[PDB]
Structure 1
Amino acid sequence: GSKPYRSYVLLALTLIYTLNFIDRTVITVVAQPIINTFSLSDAQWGLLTGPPFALFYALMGIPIAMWADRGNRVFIISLCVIIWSIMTVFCGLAASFIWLLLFRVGVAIGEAGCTPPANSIITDYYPPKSRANAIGIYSMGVTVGGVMAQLFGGALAGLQGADFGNFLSSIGLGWLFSGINWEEVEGWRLVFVIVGAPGILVALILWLTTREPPRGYSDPKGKTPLEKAGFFEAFREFGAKPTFWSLSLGAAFVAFVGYGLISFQAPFLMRVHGVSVSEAAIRYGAPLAAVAAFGTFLGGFLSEKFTPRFPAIVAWLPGVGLLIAIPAYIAAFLTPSLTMAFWMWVIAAIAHYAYLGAQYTVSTAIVSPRSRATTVSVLLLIVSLIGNGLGPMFTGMMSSAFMGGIIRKNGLEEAFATFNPGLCAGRMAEIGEMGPALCSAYAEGLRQSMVATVVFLVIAAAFYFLASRTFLKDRWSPA
């Protein structure tokens, strides 16, 4: 490609990836409102924010990959942008929670067709002198995507549907004004619609302003490997090594905790501290997500600070920094002062994602570079699968379980057989003799579930240490 033109192509791909993660994580913002509207158990909210992305790499990742290395390299991104933005707005207008679940699966279907083609495009668009910092810029999409999803969700939540209707009517899109009443539409429907909708426009803009690179605009002298570089074989080279399995296990459990936590984050701060969706997702969710990214990068940086030689670094021997994350999290959860909560949480996130990025760096250091590629792929697959799939599922089913127990220990089942969530928020009076009891249970069950999930950081530390042992033999030396 050219130079200002390929710079533009890079801006467009980084923006696509930003939007990918905006549409991917905004759902954690409108958690509680979605629950109020569809009257869901936290176990269901977990079933919705976790195992749907089972499909993300379960099918699409593998066929998208196959289909992206083969051909049609720009059309694929723009098609998938259309796909996951359409699926998003469809979430904004879902009858049953089953339709929400399928629309989320479809969003994942679409989003799995972003990175393989975007990578191929940056590669064959950029010369090896600077391809590196290019891929780095593109990667920055995740961080910006998360923090911006939190901000835009907070902004668009708590937005009267009548405001949106009157706006659309004020611009001449009256095909929807009389079509349906806007005072009965909930703000998360608007979040979804406004976040997904411009994706179609952006996929068009991509299809139009982006030439496909000729490919192989790569490096010149490279003798034939004859052995198909790294493919299946790299797996057994890293599958021999048990440090690989133990680090991918510990990393997947770090992620299991982090994912469950974000999945019920806004619900927590709302139920306990009574904060608007806006506050919960703006004053806290976005700074927290930034701090999470920073803790990750800091962890990789403290690896790069001493992974030149000494590895799996820690105080001495085990990674107790995870263990240290544990009580600060628990403190955030067991506090009456919200300031306190925020700050404690900040601290522990810094530690928590530290040990994630750390593990990430350490992975690269166990295998030959001819295989480090597919090694980091397989590790991120393990981590997304286990973490995403099972983290919220545990956090939510525990929230139900621990609410359950409370009900049982106060035999409240007669009052609960008519319990919905939404009434608890602001409509306190018009519930019953056992109204406040039932809201207090809805909150404390989730509280106990959060405090329960962090204890998986014990499993995480256990795996980290477990690998810090077998590491030395597993290490890859040039000698």
Structure 2
Amino acid sequence: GSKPYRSYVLLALTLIYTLNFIDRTVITVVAQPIINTFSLSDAQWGLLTGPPFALFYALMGIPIAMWADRGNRVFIISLCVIIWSIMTVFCGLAASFIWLLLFRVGVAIGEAGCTPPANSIITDYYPPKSRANAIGIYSMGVTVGGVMAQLFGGALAGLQGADFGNFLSSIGLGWLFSGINWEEVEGWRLVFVIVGAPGILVALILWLTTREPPRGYSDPKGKTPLEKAGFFEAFREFGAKPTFWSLSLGAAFVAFVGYGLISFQAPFLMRVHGVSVSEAAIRYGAPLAAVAAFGTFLGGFLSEKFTPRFPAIVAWLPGVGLLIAIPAYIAAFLTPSLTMAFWMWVIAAIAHYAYLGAQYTVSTAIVSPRSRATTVSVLLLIVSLIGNGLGPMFTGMMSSAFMGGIIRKNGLEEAFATFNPGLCAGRMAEIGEMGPALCSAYAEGLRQSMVATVVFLVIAAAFYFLASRTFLKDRWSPA
């Protein structure tokens, strides 16, 4: 490439990645609003927030991996940013819950085509002396975008539709001030559309200002590897090792709990402690996201910095730091004090994401570097599928089922038959004789659900312990 122009291309692609994760994770802060207007059950919310990314990498992610390895990359990234920005805008203007699901699946379809082509671009722009730091500052995209989603979405949520209609009519775009009543549009619609709309032009300027590099700007003297690095047979190195599957299942259940909690942490915060959407996303969401990222990098470090000396590192032999994160989570949920809950939560978050980072780097040192790149990838794919697709589902169906348990044991099904979640933000008389009891059930079902999902950290710890046992055999050493 060059050097200042190359750094500009880098900043552009990293902003694409931060925007990617902003768009991806912004849906969790508008959980209660979306379910409030569409009268969704927590089950339906978990359905919306999880398996719509089984289409993340099972489809696209593997097809467009080849498509990007064989084609023009910059064009692919510009196109895909077009795609998922448009789909988020459509999420903003969804008529039914099913339309929202379809637009979210399209968002996953689009976001699958971000990291493979950008990885190829960065490796071909930069020389091997600087590729590591480039991929590192690009990897900061998930961290940045994660806390940025909470911040931006909390700000944009709690914005009256009348305000946005007036601002559109005031800058000369009165070609919508006659279309729809802005007093009747909700804040999360604005969140989606205003978050998505920058992406079209950002991808345009990407297409204009970044020239595709010639494929292959690496090292001169190259051996004919005969098996081209490693493809299917590189799988058979770790695929034989059982520690790999123990690590993958443990990390997948860690991520299962994580994705299930993030899918309903804002609904919990506003159903129990009554914080606004904005204050739940801002005073609690972004700090906990930064705390979880710090815990993940801390686990990766703490491992790396004493993993060569001895195996799946922990105190004594079982991985009971997860078992310590469990009581902190349960205490954070069962507390009536909100600040107490927040600090217990940051403690539990550090301790919970540390083992994700751990298992990550414990897997990096179990396989030859000829293939370790391909091993960590399928690790992340198993984690994504199991955790992301099943965590929100478990948490939401458990919220719905624990609520229904309160319903039956209190026998107010007659009242629930006309129960909408929306009018319990105030307007609690307007349900009937049993309004506040019904919504106490609505909050307590989610509380019990959170505790239930947290219990899955014992399954995660069991898998990590199994991996610790089989690691000595499965270890890979130069001798």
Which band: TM-score by shorter chain? over 0.9
For 1:378 and 1:18, how far apart are their aligned partners in 2?
23
The CA deviation at 1:311 is 2.1
The CA deviation at 1:160 is 0.2
Q: Deviations over 1:417-443 (max 9, x none)?
A: 001100111111222110000000000
Please state whether the residue corresponding to 1:53 is helix, strand or coil: helix
The CA deviation at 1:465 is 0.3
Preserved CA contact (<8 Å) 2:269 2:275: yes
Question: Structure 1 stretches (4+) deviating beyond 3 angstroms?
Answer: none
The CA deviation at 1:3 is 0.3
The CA deviation at 1:371 is 1.0
Preserved CA contact (<8 Å) 2:33 2:188: yes
Paired residues for 1:290-301 under 5 Å: 290-301=290-301
The CA deviation at 1:133 is 0.3
For 1:60 and 1:212, how far apart are their aligned partners in 2?
22
The CA deviation at 1:142 is 0.1
Preserved CA contact (<8 Å) 1:303 1:311: no
With the length of structure 1 as denominator, give the TM-score of the two structures: 1.00
Q: Deviations over 1:13-40 (max 9, x none)?
A: 0000000000000000100000000000
The CA deviation at 1:305 is 1.2
Please state whether the residue corresponding to 2:305 is helix, strand or coil: helix
The CA deviation at 1:308 is 2.5
Please state whether the residue corresponding to 1:52 is helix, strand or coil: helix
Preserved CA contact (<8 Å) 1:415 1:434: yes
Aligned to 1:354: 354
For 1:44 and 1:352, how far apart are their aligned partners in 2?
26
Q: Deviations over 1:341-386 (max 9, x none)?
A: 0000000000000000000000011111111011011100000000
For 1:361 and 1:58, how far apart are their aligned partners in 2?
24
Give the stretch that moved more between structures: 220-229 or 276-285: 220-229
Aligned to 2:205: 205
CA RMSD of aligned residues (A): 0.5
The CA deviation at 1:310 is 1.3
For 2:179 and 2:75, how far apart are their aligned partners in 1?
34
Q: Deviations over 1:143-197 (max 9, x none)?
A: 0000000000000000000000000011000010011110000000000000000
For 1:55 and 1:295, how far apart are their aligned partners in 2?
28
Aligned to 1:101: 101
Q: Deviations over 1:197-221 (max 9, x none)?
A: 0000100000000000112110111
For 1:425 and 1:314, how far apart are their aligned partners in 2?
45
Please state whether the residue corresponding to 2:234 is helix, strand or coil: helix
For 2:6 and 2:406, how far apart are their aligned partners in 1?
59
For 2:223 and 2:92, how far apart are their aligned partners in 1?
53
Preserved CA contact (<8 Å) 1:291 1:350: yes
The CA deviation at 1:309 is 2.0
Q: Deviations over 1:103-134 (max 9, x none)?
A: 00000000000000000000000010011000
For 1:404 and 1:134, how far apart are their aligned partners in 2?
51
The CA deviation at 1:307 is 1.4
Q: Deviations over 1:65-110 (max 9, x none)?
A: 0100001111000000000000000000001000000000000000
Aligned to 2:305: 305
For 1:387 and 1:423, how far apart are their aligned partners in 2?
32
Aligned to 2:113: 113
For 1:155 and 1:363, how far apart are their aligned partners in 2?
39
For 2:416 and 2:179, how far apart are their aligned partners in 1?
37
Preserved CA contact (<8 Å) 2:418 2:431: no
Paired residues for 1:48-67 under 5 Å: 48-67=48-67
For 1:455 and 1:430, how far apart are their aligned partners in 2?
36
For 1:122 and 1:311, how far apart are their aligned partners in 2?
33
Provide structure 2 residue ranges, at least 5 long, that are not aligned to the other structure. none
The CA deviation at 1:227 is 1.2
For 2:230 and 2:378, how far apart are their aligned partners in 1?
13
Identity, in percent, stands at 100
The CA deviation at 1:456 is 0.4
Provide structure 1 residue ranges, at least 5 long, that are not aligned to the other structure. none
For 1:337 and 1:23, how far apart are their aligned partners in 2?
32
Preserved CA contact (<8 Å) 2:246 2:467: yes
Please state whether the residue corresponding to 1:217 is helix, strand or coil: coil
Count of residues in Structure 1 that have an aligned counterpart in Structure 2:
479
Preserved CA contact (<8 Å) 1:253 1:386: yes
The CA deviation at 1:234 is 1.1
Q: Deviations over 1:275-314 (max 9, x none)?
A: 1000000000000000000000000010121012212110
The CA deviation at 1:45 is 0.1
Preserved CA contact (<8 Å) 2:260 2:393: yes
Preserved CA contact (<8 Å) 1:243 1:467: yes
For 1:124 and 1:236, how far apart are their aligned partners in 2?
28
For 2:258 and 2:219, how far apart are their aligned partners in 1?
40
For 2:311 and 2:198, how far apart are their aligned partners in 1?
45
With the length of structure 2 as denominator, give the TM-score of the two structures: 1.00
